């Protein structure tokens, strides 16, 4: 089996860097620092990054470069009993793309809207406004701000929907934007990594261009320093609370994104003897250092808001699409040279989203290609196939009720799935396959065994830190709601179906691919425990 290789090494590094650094670096990590003790949040975040995140990040990268195949085949060739870990992970990626791509479309619809002398979301006297319109954020829900009203009444038209049952009309001015984001991935992924590794040059490096000029802009702002206090000023009593230790753990895991077969896939196109330990440590550090930089560009202007604009930090220090689509653009409309800072900011949102979706799909193409030879044969027209299923189910997120669709998939489709799909990923390679064999594997590639530190981290703290996240993520489960809208009972259930449908194939394939092989029980448990390498 002779497979394509990276036409240059930084092609791989940028594609990994681009996949790892994404929206969560800018629209969640800063809020977590502000909410969990500032600089004192970096200690539990640093520890859960050393024992939790990087070991999982390092492992998948080594697994990719070593077994030279995508997620489906790779996990089949490791523990045949757990080949459904492959199918689960490619299903989670699949579900994720049904919803994670509209955030890119939102940031593009704003990009097109910033071509004017006066940006449309600054005043409260347009067709789409209400008497409850205030200039900026406040304590109360019923009286929203001018940018809150531009997003929910002109872009989404969310107010014209009575819930998930009423998607209503279909936003034809915005279904277009989701079409643009799907071409830019086509013309960069149909030719393999030959062109993908080249496109990521722009979309993984442009964020740092945008981060730099927005950093120098936000720092030479009245009240800039004030924000940096709200961001880093220590409060070490946070360290004592398990919530920041959980918030650290869950932020570290989801922001590094190991397990989806994307780092598997990206590394599976590497030269076998590449120093993957160096690549893991470097790119994982770029990911966290980017978040630190991102907090300064975010909270500097957040400070310019509490000073020059007179708002509570409580009312503007948020996270998620609220921060990048209502509050931060509201600052932009006020500053001088306003519309310039908006264009490069919304491109930063788009370029931060594209590389990270390049990874999720590539996890699919190189997992399906390397398992079925027919699909590998016509990659250019298979990557045309699923990019139509993503777009057709994707106009649902483009209806007036599209946000109700996006939110349901956000809390259900992949969040709970991948956590247990990786917990099984963890103890599969660490106890079934063994750290004995795994240390042997990377010593043969890079020349030295991983220290005892990495294997005790892979064997003990990896599943605990995983359970520590899953437990925390469960005790914060209320039935799904948004604002005054409580979803119907059946919508919570269908969400649990999308969550289970991916990870159900863990014991499925197991049970299927168990009886399907011959022999007695124990005499067959070892047939599905003997790895593909140990067979030749």
């Amino acid at each position: 089996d002779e497979r394509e290789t990276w036409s240059g090494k930084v092609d791989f590094l940028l594609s990994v860097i681009g996949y790892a650094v994404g929206l969560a670096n800018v629209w969640r990590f800063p809020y977590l620092c502000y909410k969990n003790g500032g600089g004192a949040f970096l200690v539990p975040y640093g520890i859960m990054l050393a024992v939790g995140g990087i070991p999982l990040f390092y492992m998948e990268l080594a697994l990719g470069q070593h077994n030279r195949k995508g997620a489906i085949t790779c996990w089949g060739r490791l523990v045949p009993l757990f080949k459904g870990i492959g199918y689960a992970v490619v299903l989670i990626s699949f579900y994720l793309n049904f919803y994670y791509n509209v955030i890119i479309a939102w940031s593009l619809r704003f990009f097109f809207a910033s071509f004017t002398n006066s940006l449309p979301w600054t005043s409260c006297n347009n067709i789409w406004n209400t008497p409850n319109c205030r200039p900026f954020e406040g304590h109360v829900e019923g009286f929203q701000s001018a940018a809150s009203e531009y997003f929910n009444r002109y872009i989404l038209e969310l107010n014209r929907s009575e819930g998930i049952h009423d998607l209503g009309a279909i936003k034809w001015d915005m279904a277009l934007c989701l079409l643009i984001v799907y071409l830019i991935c086509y013309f960069s992924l149909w030719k393999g990594i030959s062109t993908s590794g080249k496109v990521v040059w722009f979309t993984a490096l442009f964020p740092y261009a945008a981060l730099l000029i927005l950093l120098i802009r936000g720092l030479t702002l009245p009240g800039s320093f004030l924000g940096i206090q709200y961001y880093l000023t220590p409060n070490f009593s946070a360290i004592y609370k398990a919530e920041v230790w959980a918030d650290a753990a869950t932020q570290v895991f989801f922001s590094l994104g190991p397990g989806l077969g994307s780092l598997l896939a990206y590394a599976s196109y590497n030269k076998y003897h590449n120093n993957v330990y160096k690549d893991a440590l470097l790119t994982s550090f770029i990911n966290s250092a980017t978040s630190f930089i991102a907090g300064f560009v975010i909270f500097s202007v957040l400070g310019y808001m509490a000073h020059t604009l007179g708002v509570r930090i409580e009312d503007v220090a948020t996270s998620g699409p609220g921060l990048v689509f209502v509050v931060y653009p509201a600052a932009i409309a006020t500053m001088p040279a306003s519309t310039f800072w908006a264009l490069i900011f919304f491109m930063m949102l788009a370029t931060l989203g594209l590389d990270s979706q390049f990874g999720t799909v590539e996890a699919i193409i190189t997992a399906l290609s390397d398992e079925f030879p027919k699909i590998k044969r016509n990659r250019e027209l298979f990557v045309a196939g699923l990019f139509s299923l993503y777009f057709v189910v994707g106009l649902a997120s483009c209806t007036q009720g599209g946000f109700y669709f996006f939110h349901l998939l956000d809390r259900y489709a992949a969040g709970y799935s991948i956590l247990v799909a990786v917990f099984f990923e963890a103890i599969a390679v660490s106890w079934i396959y063994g750290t004995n064999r795994f240390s042997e594997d990377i010593r043969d590639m890079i020349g030295f065994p991983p220290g005892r530190y990495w294997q005790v981290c892979w064997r003990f703290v990896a599943p605990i830190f995983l359970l520590f996240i899953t437990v925390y993520l469960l005790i914060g489960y209320e039935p799904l709601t948004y604002a005054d809208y409580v979803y119907p009972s059946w919508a919570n259930a269908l969400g649990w179906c999308i969550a289970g449908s991916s990870v159900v194939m863990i014991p499925a394939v197991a049970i299927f691919k168990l009886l399907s092989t011959p022999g007695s029980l124990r005499q067959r448990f070892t047939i599905l425990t003997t790895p593909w390498r140990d067979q030749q």
Partner: antibody
Amino acid sequence: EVQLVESGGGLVKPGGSLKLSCAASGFTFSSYAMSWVRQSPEKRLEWVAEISSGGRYIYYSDTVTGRFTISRDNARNILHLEMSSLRSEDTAMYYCARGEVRQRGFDYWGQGTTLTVSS
Amino acid sequence: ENVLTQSPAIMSTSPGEKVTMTCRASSSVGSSYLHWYQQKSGASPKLWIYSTSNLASGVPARFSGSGSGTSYSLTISSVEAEDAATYYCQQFSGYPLTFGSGTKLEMKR
């Protein structure tokens, strides 16, 4: 504390077949790549074969490939080299040497067992 | 196969001299993978210098190593009478693993 002793070895005829063994003591033999390296009477050092920590990776000298076979026993802590089709050029002292990490070379070397293949 | 020839084959020196033996590789070798062994007569080689320049345990500080790519060298800064031995360079960067021709340290008199 760490100790390597080789054995087997002696006069053997061309085409003949012998098997050496190394006896690791004083360290977890199971977690270390091992290598046989031989020294001709001209004192030329020549590496022969390497077996990884769990036997799942094997490399051979080309002048020795096809005829020699290297093996471990991590239960009894013993490394093996069994040879057939012995040409006379294979006469040497046979050193068995610990060498897990490549970036650090062969930490420990045995005392050697000498094999003259001659008629 | 990457042949490493050393020079000089026999180096005659005095306890006090400052000597340097070189190791020229037919093909380039990474600095992490070139090593040095000392073998006193009637005994087995001891790892002397690993990764071009790091000294094993109990290697006197008078020894040093340097080089890159195709050319490396072992340097004794002030030879003592106990450095009479044979010194081998070995590459660990590709298979087959290869050793050097050897440099033998003999004492002048």
